[PDB]
Each structure stands twice: as C-alpha cells, then as structure tokens.
RNA sequence: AGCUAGUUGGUGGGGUAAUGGCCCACCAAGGCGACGACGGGUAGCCGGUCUGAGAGGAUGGCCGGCCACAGGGGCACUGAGACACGGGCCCCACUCCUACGGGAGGCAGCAGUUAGGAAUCUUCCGCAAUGGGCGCAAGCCUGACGGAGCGACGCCGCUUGGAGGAAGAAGCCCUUCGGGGUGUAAACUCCUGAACCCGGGACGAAACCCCCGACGAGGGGACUGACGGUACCGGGGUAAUAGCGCCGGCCAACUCCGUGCCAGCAGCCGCGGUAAUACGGAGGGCGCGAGCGUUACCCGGAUUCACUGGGCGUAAAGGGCGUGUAGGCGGCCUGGGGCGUCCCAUGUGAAAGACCACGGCUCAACCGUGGGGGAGCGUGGGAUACGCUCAGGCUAGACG
RNA sequence: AUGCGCGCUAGGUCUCUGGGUCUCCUGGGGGCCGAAGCUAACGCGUUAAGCGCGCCGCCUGGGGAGUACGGCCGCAAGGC
C-alpha cells in the first residue's frame, strides 16, 4: 500500500497463537484419566494407538497419545501430559509422558528411555 | 571434562593425523600410518561425498580436538573473537593458543597437550610468580612461565627439556631450556601456525 | 496532475538508457537544473542544455552509453543502471551526517538536496550538512 | 537530610564501595545526587581509595552530613586537611 | 518385547462401513469395531457382510479389533 | 521556557475563553511520512478581544480550570476563518457517520 | 460511534503548602470525538532484558527509578511529610476467644506451614562490615543488609588421569569365513596426585572511643569478625562418578537380528503389510559432556503484516460505478518568513547493564576503575536547497 | 476477472470519428500483431500487466464461510 494509507490504517499485526491449550502456556500439566481407549490412524497410516482421554487441573477434557510399548495405565491413575502434536491422530495435541506419577515407564527400553520414564538397566 | 578417552579414534575419524600422544603420533603409530581410516564398522567402508555443512562440522570438530577444549568453552571463546576487531579467524586462532594448557605444550614443557594441562593443573607449572593450575588462562603478551620450584624436581619435566633441546620453538615465544623457564614473547599469529584446520569453514559452521 | 517533476524527470532519463535514446527531453525546473549539473560533474550524462521546444523551456538531456558490445546482447554497456527517486512525496527522507549513505560503497552516488546547496554523498560529508535524499544513482 | 556515604556493588565476599552523596532516606544502593569517589576494603589495587575533593568540599559547604566511615575516608583522602 | 496379549477370536460380519471398519458380530460374544488388515487390502480380498473373519483384539480395549484373517 | 504554541482560534462560545487550534507537523515513529496532527487547546483572555478565526500565539501557563491550561499570549494575524472552517466541516461531518 | 450534566466555562466563596470543577452556590451552554472520544479486553510503567544484520519484534524475572496496594471497601486524624503495610475509626468478608453482651486478628516482611499447582529454598547465624533510626555519647535496635544452607535452577571453572604399551588379548559383534571392528582402548609398566589428613591461616577493620592538639585540623593508642578454622599457603597423600540424545532427508552418524501397516516412531516429509540405513534390541558411529534431551513461551528463519522489504489480469486479493467531504498529495518563476528540515554550540539523556581499554578475585564468570558513545528532547545561534507558509507573477495542468 | 489520474518509453496494421496544405499528416476512441521492458508462465505490451509518481480500495494458507454472533439497512426475501 501507500504510505499515508498505512499510517491510517496500520500493519495488524499477527498475533501467532498456540497449537496448545494445555492453558496458561503451563509446559507441563498432570491429570487425571476419563477413559483409556486403543485409536484408528489416519488415511496413510493404520495400527491401533494408544490414546487416554484425561480431564486436566486446568479443567478440560483432552486426549492424550501414550507412547511406549504397551502402558501400565488404567481409568483412574494419575498422569502427566508434556503436549505435541500426533499427525496421524486427529485432534490429539498431547503426549502423556512416561516417568512421573501412575505413568510408569516401559519395561526393557534400553536405548531411549529417558523420553519414557526407564531407568538404567542395572550392570554387574 | 575433556574429551577423555580413545584420542588416536578421533584422528581416524577426522582422517587427517593430529599429534596428541606426542612421541608414539610420532611413530608408525599415531595409527593413521599403520591404520589410515575412520573408526568403526564403516570404516574400512568406501567413502561418501559429504555436505559442505558436515565437511564445516568436521573442520570445526577436528579444531577443537587439537586444542581439546570443551566445545561450550570454544564457542565462547569464538564469540570473543567476532566481538573483537579484526581477522575473526586468525584472532580467534591466537586467543585460543594463548590458553596455558597449550601454550605449557608448545614452548615443549611437555610431550603431549593432554599431559601438559594435566601438570598445570597438578601445580606443577607457574606464569610469572603465582602457582596457576587453571589451563583455561589467557596468557597475555611478554610474560614469564616456568616450572614451580616445588615441582622442578620431576624427571618427566626433566624429559620434557631434553626433547625440546633438540628442536626450535613458535616464533611468538621463546624459552630458557636450562633453567626451566620460558617467554610467551607476542601474541600468536594463524600462520606461525600449520594448523590441519581452515579457519574460514570453521567460521562458517559458526555463523547460524 | 503532473505530480512530481525531479521523479519524472528521472523517470524519464531511466527511460532514455533503456532504449538508448541519445537524446531526451524534460521541462525546466532550478531544481531540475541543479540535479542534472551534479549527475554531468559526477559523469552520469555527457552533458544538459535547455532548448526551447514547442514555446516552452524545455531541457535536453545528453544520455551517456558505454561501449557497444561484443557477443550476445551487442547492446550496449549502461552508465545508468538504476536510478530511483528516494524521497517520493509522501515518503519525504531526511538524513543527517550519519544517516547519508554510502551508496554502493562508494561507486555510484546518491544526490542531496541540502541547505547548503544540492550536491554529492562526499561533498555532504565533507561539508557535514545533511538534507533531503531525492535520489540514488548508480 | 543529605549524607556522603557508601555505597555497596561488587559481589559476595567482594565488597566495593562508592564515596556518595544521597538522602538518608533511600537505599543503599539508590539513586544518588552524586557520585564523588570510590573505595575499596581488600585495598586490592594501587589505587584502591580515590576521591574528588572539590566536589566533597561543596557537598560538605552545603551541607551534606557524611557518616563516619565516609567521614574517615575523606579524612585520609586529605578533605579536611586546610592549609 | 511385542506384547503378545492379542485375542485371536472369530467374527461373523454384520455390517460395512467405510476405510474397510466393520460391525463384525464374534463368536466370543459382542460386536465391536474392528478395521481390516493391511495384508488383506493389499491382496485386494472384499470382505463381504456375513462372514467369519479372525478379529484380533486389544486387552486396552476390545471394543476395537483388528481382521486378520480372510472370512 | 514556558510552552509557546501558534494556532487558530476556533471557538468563542465561553466568557473570557478561546479554543485554539495547533496544528503541530512531526515526522511518523516508523513510516516517516510527516502527519498533520491537532490538539484543541483552551485558553484564557481577560479580554475577548481574541474571537473567531483569529491566528494567536498561545502561552503555558498555571492552570486556570479543568483542562484551561493556557493563556492568550498575542495575535499574529486575524480573520482567517478559512482555516477555521475546515475544522467545522469536519465536526460537521462527524454527525454523518453514526447509525 | 457518539460520549459528557460537576459535564465545559465564569463570578464569588470553601478547601489546600499551592493552582485548579478539588468542592459548593449561581449564571452561561459548552467541552470532547473517526487526527478514535466513550465502551470492552488486556497490562504496573520504564532504565532495561532477550532476540535481531538492522529497522523492528517480544518482554518488563532479579538489580535501579517512579507508581499503586497492603483481606475487600471508605474515611479522616496526627504530623515536615501518610490518606499511613507490622497506627486509628466504620462496614463487609473470614479466622480466633466468649460467662453470647462482645472483643482480637492480617506473613503481597524474613522463615516456614497449608492450599493451589508442573514448579520454587533454611521455622539458619550475625550486628563484624555497609546503610537506617534514636541518642552527647557509650550503646541500643535493624529477617534493610552481610553471609552460610538447600536446588546442576542458570552461567563460568575443574576432576573422573597422563605417558608408554600388538600389524593388534580376551569379551562382544559382523563376516564375503580369508578377515574386520571395538582399539592403544584395555591389562600391564612408569609418573602425577582430584579426593583426604596434619601444620599455619586471613584480607575484609578503622573508624565511632580515649588523650595531646581549642572537643577543629593534625598525632598516638586501643577495642571491635557472622562468614570460619572457610579461602588460601606448606607438608603428606589414593587412579579416583559417565551420562544422555541421536544415527532415512532436513542433519553429524550404519550395520545385524527381532518385528512384519503389528508392535511402534514422528518435528515435518512420512516409515512399517518379510534381508525396514526410519519400529524393538545389539554392536558400531556421531553430537555434546556433568550434563544431555523433551515440552512450553518468545524472537529468528518469516521480505509469512513487507519502513528498510511484498502484493492484487489468471494464484488470496481492485471496491459495481459516479459524484464528493474530511484527509493525503501538488506545475513554473521571484522574493520575504523560517514552522518542518539541516548544522554547530551547549543543557539533558542518572547509576547498573550494553560497548572499548586496563585492573582484581589462581583464569573466567563476577566485579572494579577509566573512556566513549547513545536515539530522543530543550535552549541559543545560524543555513534556506527542498517541503510549508505569506506576497507578486507566469501559462505547459485544469477550466472556459 | 486489470481502481482512478498524469507523465515517459520502437513500430506496423485495420477500424470508427474530427481537423488539415485531402494519395498523406495530425488529434480523439475501438481492435490486432509485436521493440524495450515486465511477468510464474500464459501473456501484456502508447488502450501496459513496462518505467515512475500521486491517492484510494483491498490480500496474508485452504476448508470452516461469506457462515455464526453482534450492528445497520430492508415490508419480507436477504444484503452489507
Ligand atoms: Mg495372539
Ligand atoms: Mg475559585
Ligand atoms: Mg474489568
Ligand atoms: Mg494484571
Ligand atoms: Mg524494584
Ligand atoms: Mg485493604
Ligand atoms: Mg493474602
Ligand atoms: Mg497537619
Ligand atoms: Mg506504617
Ligand atoms: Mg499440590
Ligand atoms: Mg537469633
Ligand atoms: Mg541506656
Ligand atoms: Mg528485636
Ligand atoms: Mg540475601
Ligand atoms: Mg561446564
Ligand atoms: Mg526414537
Ligand atoms: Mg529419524
Ligand atoms: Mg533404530
Ligand atoms: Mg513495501
Ligand atoms: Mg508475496
Ligand atoms: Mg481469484
Ligand atoms: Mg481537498
Ligand atoms: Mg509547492
Ligand atoms: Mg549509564
Ligand atoms: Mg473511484
Ligand atoms: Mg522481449
Ligand atoms: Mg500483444
Ligand atoms: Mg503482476
Ligand atoms: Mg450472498
Ligand atoms: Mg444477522
């Protein structure tokens, strides 16, 4: 435009807003399980992933995507989401991450377990 | 701490042979001449023509290697060099050799870099009175370094003389091979050096 | 409205370089004058004179070339390669001494109309006065 | 009221001290009228106490009422000493 | 570790739905949503409604299932 | 230095009172582009000699009521009612544009 | 999208240290507004901080200034100064005691408990230093402060050895069964001596005090340490924590089995439906390193809100056109003014930080000293090329 | 599927409409093909989408959706 035009007018800024309402932009948010249920992928991609319903402190209801190989987790234990993104799960924004509270980390990891809640194997 | 470990590895890996034994990478056993590949499985796999962001990556690792500083301490150390004026290269180059550690190794007070940090920290060492054990030490210009009296004794230190009553110094320092002692005569200069780094790739990988 | 003149009249020196049209001509403003005389010092035309065209002054615009090429595009070398007004009306430009800029690192120039007269980058610098940036040229 | 005094900014266990005139009422640290002089306690420098005489010969003509360590300094930094 | 929990228990097709999801009424007992198999739809075998197909299924949830095997 | 503004009187409907328009030039904070801005201002005459349309340069001052802040330092030209009448245009305009 | 009835101005009066619609009585009928009023949301603001090539953009943690508030609300009083955090009165809410009439509370002070919460510390020592208040002074207070304690919470520093030492031990993995890797890594030999103990061990603290000197200047003296028996120095003195992420492309680094669109991974592209360089392990490798990753939030990259630096025939995008107000913008010449604009001088731009130098803590962090700069804003002088403005004129625009 | 205004920047060709010293000039429109240049190409190209400048109107992923909610207009439809 010209420049006396944006003077009037003004550059309206973009207020980039989040992919995540975890609220507060509080990075980390434990909650508490509604209904833990195995979910259909999306068009590309097929299995059957792990994903809890959890109502939060915050107040809402999510999902959330647990990872691993198979969680120790139920209908009623507390848990710990860390957020991101699943593509192939539709409006799942949340991972639950293993370690912290009723989220128990997976058994036999060996390599990457400190993104899923495993400590060290023992040496002798 | 260092990088502490398998070192002759790391001059396989960067394929150029680095001296970090001293004696022995003076050898048919740095194993670059016996062995002249990089570690591992895939080693002894034919090459891949790399990146120009890994080959800067490379450059910048085997760098460091020679000086065997922690890699938070080298990009300190280059950040200094751009905030100063001049060559960000060949400056950052001489703040980098103005460390003590290296400086104790190429005046010959010692075979090896590791082992010449390792006697400046054992206080074995002092620049001009005080008993200094921290290799980090940007030593400035014209300054006085020599072994402390306490520690004159050592055979090692000893050795370490002979070997260098037998070949010069860099010509930004000179040393009193007798009585132990030595100069930090002018700030080092990049090509005073032969260094198996160039500066420019190193300054790119940086830059982003 | 013939909105601007100084624009114009680069507008149509710009015009000139493109078609290597030796020849071209403007009407006359002090201004104007004193745009051409700095770009004819510095040695962007070959040279200006006002003719009278029609019943009006007018002004010549002698257009400087480069050597006609060899090769393809035997067109030749510009002298003029790009000249744009900088403080249109509207965005009216005011630099001081250390806010002149050094156009192109030194090789073409930027033209200042100042209190001081209307003149060069260096000149600007020398003299230490600053003014409006009507235009850069190289 | 209006003091020459002292002003802390170095760090733990290293105390460094600024010769300065305030009001009593603000923080030792604070927005101060005039910084005059600085003084060091491990007397760590050749020049570890220095201060500007004139402008605390002002400071003192108008009123500024120094505390006593800063009234010391001063003394040692030959403010009071009239010949 | 492969969890090896998975319940390899028989369905009667009752219903289609779309991205090959079927009502499959089981020999077990309920009717569950289950998906096809992956090989199943590479080998392009349709399953039809009113067939015994294998529905694999979750201990998590057996309200999903998985056919694995062709009718 | 007390404040010394030059602008226009553009209302006398008050005793003793003169609305004054400044139109104060500056450059934009970004864009560069210099803005034509206006501050009405009121200021106090112990006269109203000063009326409609009369150019005035206008001192600060110690006020003398809630938003009159000024008083009538002295003319600079009078009759000008041209540049007052655009002022009235446009608050004649704002009438316009409600519902 | 209109707002405003003490609301806007005036006379008098009250009030105040002082002006004032601060308030009152009365007259006038304004005042503000699209150059964004009023309403709703958001938010302490700044010096700064982070980022960024810069312009900007975000942010305002601690440290400095100012503001505002001390459960919510309201009011005064005393006073130099409060509308008064550990003062008062009143109401409301809440907690506590009650011989039921009523009283007492306020940690958004340190510290801690509890709650909320992903998350955040010792119910620490000490008046020695600095400052504060009182006092002739001694001194007395001082959770300001000085410190220690806790937390890799952040930054910086160091240790987990160094030297030698096979055409190359085993262990483990691959194999084309020749061999290769792990890897000079080890073991082992030599030396050091982090840790740890013994010996000493503070700067910080010389004032205030006494006396000579006039209780001044000046001189002599003496008391006075939380940190801490720490820092440190001397002697002795042991080889003495390594971890995490990744390894298809971006992007540094590859192989084997297990698995077979399943379990799973993912930041995107996407990988997996039988030798997966992408899933699980193993080795091998790479990155860092007492850290390393993940997630959030912010900037960047994003010239993806574009001033520097975009666009609009078809991609998102030209309003359906006209007339027209505000606004924006304005041909040529000649002069005056000098608002914009430019310059110089000077004032201001506090300190801390940022920047450069040097100095100190064994370096560096950190801190000190010196210096400069710094946009903006005022004031005095000028400049007049341009824009503006006032005057005179001209006919290329425009109109007739 | 091209905002309006003005200025400049090779032509040729047909076309309508005016004046001329009327086989060809000079204006004002409508087309086509093309210099330079521009553009993502298609194309555009003195009737520019080129070089500029003035001003305004919009655009900032698609779908959601020209929807909702509010506001205004309208007898409603519906529009903005
Ligand atoms: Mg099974
Ligand atoms: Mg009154
Ligand atoms: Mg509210
Ligand atoms: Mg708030
Ligand atoms: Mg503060
Ligand atoms: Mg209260
Ligand atoms: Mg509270
Ligand atoms: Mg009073
Ligand atoms: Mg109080
Ligand atoms: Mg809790
Ligand atoms: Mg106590
Ligand atoms: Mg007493
Ligand atoms: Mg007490
Ligand atoms: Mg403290
Ligand atoms: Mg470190
Ligand atoms: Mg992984
Ligand atoms: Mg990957
Ligand atoms: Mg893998
Ligand atoms: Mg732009
Ligand atoms: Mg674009
Ligand atoms: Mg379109
Ligand atoms: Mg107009
Ligand atoms: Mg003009
Ligand atoms: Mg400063
Ligand atoms: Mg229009
Ligand atoms: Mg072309
Ligand atoms: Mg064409
Ligand atoms: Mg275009
Ligand atoms: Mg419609
Ligand atoms: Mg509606």
């Known amino acids: ?124 | 701490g260092r990088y502490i470990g398998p070192v002759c590895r790391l001059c396989r890996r960067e394929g150029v042979k680095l001296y970090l034994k001293g004696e022995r990478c003076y050898s048919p056993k740095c194993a670059m001449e016996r062995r002249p590949y990089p570690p591992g499985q895939h080693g002894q796999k034919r090459a891949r023509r790399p990146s120009d962001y890994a080959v800067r990556l490379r450059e910048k690792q085997k760098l460091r290697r020679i000086y065997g500083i922690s890699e938070r301490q080298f990009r300190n150390l280059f950040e200094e060099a751009s905030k100063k004026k001049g060559v960000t290269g060949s400056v950052f180059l001489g703040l980098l050799e103005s460390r003590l550690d290296n400086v104790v190794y190429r005046l010959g007070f010692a075979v090896s870099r590791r082992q010449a940090r390792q006697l400046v920290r054992h206080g074995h060492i002092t620049v001009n009175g005080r008993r200094v054990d921290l290799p980090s030490y940007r030593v400035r210009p014209g300054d006085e370094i020599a072994v402390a009296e306490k520690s004159r004794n050592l055979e090692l230190i000893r050795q370490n003389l002979e070997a260098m009553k037998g070949r010069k110094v860099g010509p930004w320092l000179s040393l009193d091979v007798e009585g132990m002692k030595g100069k930090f005569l002018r700030l080092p200069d990049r090509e005073d050096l032969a260094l198996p780094v160039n500066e420019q790739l190193v300054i790119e990988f940086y830059s982003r | 409205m013939l909105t601007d003149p100084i624009a114009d009249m680069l507008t149509r020196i710009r015009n000139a370089t493109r078609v290597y049209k030796e020849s071209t001509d403007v009407p006359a403003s002090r201004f104007k004058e004193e745009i051409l005389r700095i770009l004819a010092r510095e040695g962007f035309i070959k040279g200006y004179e006002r003719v009278d065209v029609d019943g009006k002054p007018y002004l010549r615009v002698y257009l400087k070339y480069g050597p006609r090429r060899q090769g393809p595009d035997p067109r030749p070398e510009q002298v003029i390669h790009h000249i744009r007004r900088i403080s249109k009306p509207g965005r009216r430009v005011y630099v001081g001494v250390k806010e002149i800029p050094r156009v192109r690192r030194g090789l073409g120039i930027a033209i200042l109309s100042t209190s001081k007269g209307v003149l060069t980058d260096r000149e600007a610098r020398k003299l230490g006065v600053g003014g409006e940036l009507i235009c850069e040229v190289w | 009221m209006v003091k020459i005094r002292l002003a802390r900014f170095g760090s733990k266990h290293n105390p460094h001290y600024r010769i300065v005139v305030t009001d009593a009422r603000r923080k030792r640290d604070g927005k101060y009228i005039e910084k005059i002089g600085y003084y060091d306690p491990r007397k760590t420098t050749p020049d570890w106490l220095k201060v500007d005489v004139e402008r605390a010969r002002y400071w003192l003509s108008v009123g500024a009422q120094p505390t006593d360590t800063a009234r010391r300094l001063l003394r040692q930094a030959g403010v009071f000493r009239q010949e | 570790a492969k969890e090896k929990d998975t319940i390899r228990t028989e369905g009667v097709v009752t219903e289609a739905l779309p991205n090959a999801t079927f009502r499959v009424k089981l020999d077990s007992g309920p009717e569950i949503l289950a998906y096809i198999s992956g090989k199943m739809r590479m080998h392009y075998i349709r399953i039809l409604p009113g067939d015994r197909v294998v529905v694999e299924i979750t201990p998590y949830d057996p309200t999903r299932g998985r056919i694995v095997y062709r009718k | 230095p007390k404040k010394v503004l030059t602008g226009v009187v553009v209302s006398d409907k008050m005793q003793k009172t003169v609305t004054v328009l400044v139109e104060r030039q500056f450059p934009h904070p970004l864009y560069g582009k210099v803005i034509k801005r206006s501050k009405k201002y009121l200021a106090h005459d112990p006269e109203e000699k000063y009326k409609l349309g009369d150019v005035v340069e206008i001192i600060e001052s110690r006020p003398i009521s809630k938003r009159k802040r000024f008083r009538v330092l002295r003319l600079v030209e009078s009759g000008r009612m041209d540049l007052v009448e655009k002022y009235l245009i446009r608050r004649q305009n704002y009438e316009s544009l409600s519902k």
Request: charged content about 30%; overall charge positive.
């Open chain 1, 1 to 124: 435009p010209t420049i006396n035009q944006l003077v009037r007018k003004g550059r309206e800024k973009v207020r980039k807003k989040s992919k995540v309402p975890a609220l507060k932009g509080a990075p980390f948010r434990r909650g508490v399980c509604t209904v833990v249920r195995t979910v259909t992928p999306k068009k590309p991609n097929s299995a059957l992933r792990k994903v809890a319903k959890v109502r939060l402190t915050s107040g809402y209801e999510v999902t959330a995507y647990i990872p691993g190989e198979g969680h120790n987790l139920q209908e009623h234990s507390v848990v710990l989401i860390r957020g991101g993104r699943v593509k192939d799960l539709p409006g799942v924004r949340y991972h639950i991450v293993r370690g912290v509270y009723d989220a128990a980390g997976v058994k036999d990891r060996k390599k990457s377990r400190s993104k899923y809640g495993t400590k060290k194997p023992k040496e002798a």
